[PDB]
Design a protein around this nucleic acid. Structure first.
Ligand SMILES: NC(=O)c1ccc[n+](C2OC(COP(=O)([O-])OP(=O)(O)OC[C@H]3O[C@H](n4cnc5c(N)ncnc54)[C@H](O)[C@@H]3O)C(O)C2O)c1
Lengths: 418, 473
RNA sequence: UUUUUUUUUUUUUUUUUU
DNA sequence: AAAAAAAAAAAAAAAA
């Protein structure tokens, strides 16, 4: 028997209204046939359409729009519908649905120009109410309303082409693993030897004053130049600690606590990163809290490392890729790196106006996606490498910390495709 | 390599028991949970500004097409989506003359001008509420852009255009929604630019706020807010277990009184006898002296958690079986000792801290697209990294512009299994009734709590504030 | 303040050491 | 008056 409703429309233009109407009608319990419904196509659909129209269709709904008005496939379907209407001796067979306001009733197709149409131009819900009322009045075959059918069809066809799929993907982070630390953290008994009103930030290697003990991983007499008094210090006065135990967390005492011994390592590591940047002779832009380092215009060959550009031009503003490094010992021994973009007017001197800097940064980062961030970050890191696999930060004349130039790679079991 | 485990995208329930990950797609096809017969809207603003609102409302009566329907679903019209009737006919319009707004706005003092401008609208809204027979569900407050661009802090009025209070906040929106709290009037503030922007053009002649490609989403996020404020349920969560109250604490600075005094505000979510969800604020704001404490001393901590537990017993009958106190700040032991005392034996109290500060960023090896949303780098049993912002395939784009930052979730106190903690925050990121988006970047407890705090710290004369979000968002 | 997101600005506090 | 490890208030841009 004829219990299917055929919806003709323009395939590449009227998908939204046709989708909404079909998904509503199916949920309401009306059998619906439409070309956007079935997923996949073959050569058979040309005969399938004709046989469905001539043998199964009970009502033929024509989406009337400026696109579907003079579309060849739509016109062919409409002609077959007219022939079926003649054969079935049912005048209320074709029910045009006008959804375009620019398509006046005086310019609709000749097959439709005589047919009363349901007005979807103003409100779609009013048109749907009219469709339902006309269907109950004309006693169209119907089933009990069930929105779950529409949900199933929507999930099967439309949320279907873009779904969670399983396939492993490797990820690149901005965390740089630390290969090694010195064996012991040294607490030098400088006392009166180191002046009380002296700054440790100018001293060569990283060293922070704790109580009366200078906290550093360096050797005792590494600090003779800035501290001439330290020539006659006794090395037995040091309270060197097994740093590996501190990282594990085993060591803790009245003299020093694991919380206050691990916060003194990150300061040393941060100052060591700053000193390495100073040694690398890369400039700095001072931010709210952190100090970020960017590379000049010309220090690199053609202002690019490897095949990847790090300094470029945006009108008169030369944008410079910048990084900032901070060490965190909580999860893993890690030197985290952040991405920053700064601008210069002449390629050497920074613009002091924060507003224009922020506006330029936003404008330039407008079009920088994942690959334009990862590539430049890893390029800067590789430029900072001391070897092919790692770079070291200097904490003494003999003590060094090896930080990998390869960011910590993670692993995901889920991904997708463009 | 280090494993990252993906959490299934949560589903939000719609009418007829239907589930869908997307709010816009599910709502456009199945309709909202409850039947609102119609939105009798009240309009206040300039007579010139009423035309723009009428035009926009007539516009959203009709379907609105966005640039790429795959990226963002089209809007099929308010009545098609909501089964709720909303014309421009039947709006009660209260006229605000341009002379009135010019009288107060052109003043040297910013706080005084803001107070006068708020008073001008609130007096007419109150008079219409009290002495007019016409009933209005929600009051859409149209504000011009001159008032907007010179009625917030740090706005320096040019000398040539100056023509001529200090206890309140100089922000128009915060003070506006704070002073109406006693009257319980649901309101929605609109700028003339947020409305039909095409008239407003820059120096080049183009619109300043070009919403040409994002028109459908603009209609989606305006209509949903209007439906929510009128008493409608757009959607609900489906995967939340029984007996689980959540609560979210956020501390805001209060500058009107000497010392910031650090007011604390909370938002509460749970389930009902049946299947209905309750997302109501739980705010009694408990002020905390000292400049930067952000830690609530035991008396007011007890007050907060006792109010939270009683508001659950009063509606379900028995105490929550696992409270997940989310917060944006770390807990020191002082709150938790007090919290344990008021809690009974059966309740398993959990304090979870959520933070964006941690600088971890995943960059995928190849491709101009960011990490899939739902990946969780579990550091250990008590802490984890969760990417609530990122790529989800259905919306065709990432939720962010650059590589997104994950959420640092740490189970600071209680015990809690980390998987369930990561599986509820992701679910919470979907109930943002202020916006019709796929998902939020932060859980809505910490977001609606932040909003309700930002509104309740603008006026000092508030007492027993309303707990419904109609009056806050 | 239709939203949401990402930065840049300051400021502040605590635990600690002199 | 420093340090790190945690804190919120505020403004500007750009997409969703
Ligand atoms: N309800 C209808 O389908 C319809 C259509 C045309 C005329 N009319 C009638 O018009 C009367 C007198 O008023 P009028 O002269 O202004 O009519 P009219 O032809 O000038 O226009 C009346 C309205 O119906 C028209 N109409 C509705 N559906 C149409 C369609 N599918 N194709 C073409 N036009 C359509 C227009 O919408 C128009 O706004 C009648 O007494 C009457 O029955 C009705």
């Amino acid at each position: 028997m004829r219990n299917k409703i055929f919806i003709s429309h323009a395939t590449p233009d009227d998908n939204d209204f046709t989708r909404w109407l079909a998904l509503k009608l199916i949920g309401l319990g009306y059998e619906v046939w439409c070309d956007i419904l079935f997923l996949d196509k073959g050569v058979d659909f040309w005969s399938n359409i004709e046989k469905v129209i001539r043998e199964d269709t009970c009502k033929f709904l024509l989406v009337s729009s400026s696109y579907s008005n003079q579309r060849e496939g739509v016109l062919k379907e409409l002609a077959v519908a007219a022939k079926v209407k003649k054969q079935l001796k049912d005048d209320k067979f074709i029910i045009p649905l006008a959804i375009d306001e620019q398509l006046s009733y005086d310019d609709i197709n000749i097959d439709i120009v005589r047919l009363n149409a349901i007005d979807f131009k103003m409100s779609w819900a009013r048109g749907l109410k009219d469709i339902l009322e006309a269907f109950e009045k004309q006693k169209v075959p119907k089933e009990v309303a069930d929105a779950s059918k529409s949900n199933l069809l929507y999930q099967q066809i439309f949320l279907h082409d873009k779904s969670v799929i399983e396939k492993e993907e490797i990820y690149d982070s901005n965390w740089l693993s630390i290969l090694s630390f010195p064996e012991e953290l040294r607490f030098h008994e400088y006392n009166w030897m180191l002046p009380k009103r002296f700054d440790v930030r100018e001293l060569t290697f990283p060293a922070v004053r704790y109580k009366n003990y200078l906290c550093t991983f360096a050797w005792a007499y590494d600090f003779t130049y800035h501290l001439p008094k330290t020539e006659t210090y006794h090395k037995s006065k040091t309270i060197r600690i097994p740093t590996e135990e501190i990282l594990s967390g085993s060591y803790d005492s009245n003299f020093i606590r694991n919380a206050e011994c691990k916060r003194l390592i990150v300061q040393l590591l941060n100052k060591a990163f700053e000193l390495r940047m100073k040694d690398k002779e890369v400039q700095e832009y001072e931010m709210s809290n952190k100090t970020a380092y960017w590379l000049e215009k010309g220090k690199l060959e053609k202002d690019k490392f490897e095949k990847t550009m790090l300094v470029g031009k945006q009108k008169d503003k030369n944008w410079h890729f910048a990084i900032s490094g901070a060490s965190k010992l909580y999860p893993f021994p890690v030197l985290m790196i952040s991405s920053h973009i700064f601008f210069t007017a002449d390629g050497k001197k920074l613009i002091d106006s924060s507003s224009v800097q922020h506006s330029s940064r936003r404008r330039q980062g407008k079009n920088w996606w994942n690959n334009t961030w990862r590539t430049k970050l890893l390029a800067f890191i590789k430029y900072l490498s001391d070897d092919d696999t790692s770079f070291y930060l200097e904490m003494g004349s003999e003590e060094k910390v090896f930080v990998s130039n390869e960011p910590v790679k993670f692993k995901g079991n889920v991904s997708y495709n463009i | 390599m280090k494993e990252l485990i993906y959490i299934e995208e949560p589903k939000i329930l719609f009418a007829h028991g239907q589930k869908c990950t997307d709010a816009r797609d599910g709502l456009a096809l199945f309709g909202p949970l409850n039947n609102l017969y119609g939105i009798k809207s009240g309009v206040i603003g300039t007579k010139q500004g009423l035309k723009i609102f009428r035009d926009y409302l007539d516009h959203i009566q009709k379907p609105i097409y966005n640039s790429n329907s795959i990226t963002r679903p089209m809007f099929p019209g308010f009545e098609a989506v909501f089964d709720c009737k909303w014309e421009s006919t039947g709006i009660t319009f209260k006229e605000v003359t341009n002379e009135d707004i010019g009288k107060f706005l052109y003043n040297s003092s910013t706080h005084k001008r803001t107070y006068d401008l708020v008073s001008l609208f609130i007096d007419k809204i109150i008079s219409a509420n009290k002495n007019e027979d016409e009933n209005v569900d929600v009051w859409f407050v149209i504000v011009p852009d001159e008032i907007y661009k010179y009625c917030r802090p740090n706005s320096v009025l040019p000398k040539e255009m100056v023509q001529t209070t200090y206890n309140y906040d100089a922000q128009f929106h915060d003070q506006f929604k704070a002073r109406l709290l006693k009257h319980t009037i649901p309101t929605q503030i609109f700028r003339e630019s947020t409305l039909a922007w095409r008239d407003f053009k820059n120096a080049f002649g183009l619109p300043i706020r070009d919403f040409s490609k994002i028109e459908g989403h603009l209609a989606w996020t305006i209509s949903t807010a209007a439906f929510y404020k009128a008493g409608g349920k757009p959607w609900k969560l489906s995967d939340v277990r029984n007996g689980v109250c959540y609560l979210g604490l956020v501390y805001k600075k209060v500058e009107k009184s000497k010392n910031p005094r650090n007011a604390c505000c909370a938002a509460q979510m749970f389930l009902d006898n049946g299947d209905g969800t309750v997302f109501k604020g739980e705010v009694g704001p408990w002020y905390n002296p000292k400049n930067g404490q952000y830690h609530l001393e035991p008396k007011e901590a007890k007050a907060l958690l006792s109010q939270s537990l009683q508001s659950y017993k009063e509606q379900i009958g028995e105490y929550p079986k696992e409270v997940f106190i989310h917060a944006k700040t770390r807990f020191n032991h002082q709150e938790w000792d007090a919290f344990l005392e008021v809690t009974p034996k059966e309740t398993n109290l959990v304090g979870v801290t959520i933070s964006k500060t941690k600088p971890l960023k995943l960059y995928k090896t190849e491709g101009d697209y960011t990490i899939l949303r739902g990946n969780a780098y579990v550091v250990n049993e008590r802490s984890a990294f969760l990417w609530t912002v990122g790529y989800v395939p259905k919306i065709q784009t990432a939720l962010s512009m650059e590589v997104p930052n994950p959420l640092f979730i740490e189970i600071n106190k209680g015990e809690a299994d980390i998987k369930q903690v990561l599986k509820d925050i992701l679910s919470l990121t979907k109930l943002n009734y202020n916006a019709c988006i796929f998902a939020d970047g932060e859980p809505v407890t910490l977001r609606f709590a932040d909003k309700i705090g930002e509104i309740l710290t603008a006026s000092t004369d508030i007492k027993t504030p309303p707990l419904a979000f109609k009056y806050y968002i």
